[PDB]
C-alpha cells in the first residue's frame, strides 16, 4: 500500500533579541511519531508513538544533534529573509518546511517533497524531478540562484531517495501492528426538529481511523448532493476521527432516506436509516 513520511518544521521569530522557537514533528502514514521543541526544558527529539521506543540512545542523540543544527539554520534563514523583504527586525515572522517521501509497495520512492514557506505563503519548492526549484517570489529567486550555485537539490534528492525511503521502511517494520491498524466507523442517524413540517436527519460516523471517509444520503436509492450539509472531519482527541452529514426532510418521510458510510476499515459500506 501507499506509505509516507514527513517532517514538518517551524521556526517563529520573537520580539527583542530573543531566539526563535523551533519545532519539528515527524509523521509516518500521517500519524505523529517524533517531536522536537526548543521551548522544552531539555530540548531533544522524543518518541511520540510507542513503537519508536525500540530505537537506541544513539539514534536519539543523532536526531537531536540534527535538530539543533536545523534550529540554527532557521535562525540564520529568518534573518536573511528579513533582508530580502526589507522588513524591520524584531517582529514576528514564521518559516516552515515540509520534507519527505511517498513509498510504493515495491519500496521505491514514488514522490519526494522539499518545500518552504515564509509567513505561511509558498516560498521555494523542489520540483517533482528532484532537480530544479520553483520560487514564488522575487526574494525566493535569490535563494534559488544561491541553491543552484551550491547544488542543494542534489543534497536533498540524495536524502529523499536514500535515507528517507530506507528509514520509512524500517519504521513501518518496527510499528508493525500499530501503523497498519484501521478502526472502522460506528454510525448512527439522529433526528432533530427544524422549520415547519421539516426535520433534519444527521448521519454520524465516529471512532474511525484513518481520517479518510465518505458519507452519502439517498432518497429512495437516488443520490443527494443538493441540500447536504457536512462538517470537516475532526479529531475525537483519542486518535480517531468524526464526521457527519445531514439533510432536511419532510416530517413523516424520514424512512425514505438512507445514509451510506464508505471507509477502508469496513468489510463493506454501511447503510443505515433513522430508527425511532
Amino acid at each position: 500500500g501507499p506509505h509516507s513520511m514527513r517532517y514538518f518544521e517551524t521556526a517563529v521569530s520573537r520580539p527583542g533579541l530573543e531566539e526563535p522557537r523551533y519545532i519539528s514533528v515527524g509523521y509516518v502514514d500521517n500519524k505523529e511519531f517524533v517531536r522536537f521543541d526548543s521551548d522544552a526544558e531539555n530540548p531533544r527529539y522524543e518518541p511520540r508513538a510507542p513503537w519508536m521506543e525500540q530505537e537506541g540512545p544513539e539514534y536519539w542523540e543523532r536526531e537531536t544533534q540534527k535538530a539543533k543544527g536545523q534550529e540554527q539554520w532557521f535562525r540564520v534563514s529568518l534573518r536573511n529573509l528579513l533582508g530580502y523583504y526589507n522588513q524591520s527586525a524584531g517582529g514576528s515572522h514564521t518559516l516552515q518546511q515540509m520534507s519527505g517521501c511517498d513509498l510504493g509497495s515495491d519500496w521505491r520512492l514514488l514522490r519526494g517533497y522539499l518545500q518552504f514557506a515564509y509567513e505561511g505563503r509558498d516560498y521555494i519548492a523542489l520540483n517533482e524531478d528532484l532537480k530544479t526549484w520553483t520560487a514564488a517570489d522575487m526574494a525566493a529567486q535569490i535563494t534559488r540562484r544561491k541553491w543552484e550555485q551550491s547544488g542543494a537539490a542534489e543534497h536533498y534528492k540524495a536524502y529523499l531517495e536514500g535515507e528517507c525511503v530506507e528509514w520509512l521502511h524500517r519504521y513501518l517494520k518496527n510499528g508493525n501492528a500499530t501503523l497498519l491498524r484501521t478502526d472502522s466507523p460506528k454510525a448512527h442517524v439522529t433526528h432533530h426538529p427544524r422549520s415547519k413540517g421539516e426535520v433534519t436527519l444527521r448521519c454520524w460516523a465516529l471512532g474511525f481511523y484513518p481520517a479518510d471517509i465518505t458519507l452519502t444520503w439517498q432518497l429512495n436509492g437516488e443520490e443527494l448532493t443538493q441540500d447536504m450539509e457536512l462538517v470537516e472531519t475532526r479529531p475525537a482527541g483519542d486518535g480517531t476521527f468524526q464526521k457527519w452529514a445531514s439533510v432536511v426532510v419532510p416530517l413523516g418521510k424520514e424512512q425514505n432516506y438512507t445514509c451510506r458510510v464508505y471507509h477502508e476499515g469496513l468489510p463493506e459500506p454501511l447503510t443505515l436509516r433513522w430508527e425511532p
Binding site: 536526531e63 540534527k66 536545523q70 536573511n80 536533498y156 536524502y159
Partner: peptide, 9 residues
C-alpha cells in the same frame, strides 16, 4: 530520520 538542510535561504 530527519533531513539536514544545506545552504541557507
Amino acid at each position: 530520520k530527519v533531513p539536514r538542510n544545506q545552504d541557507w535561504l
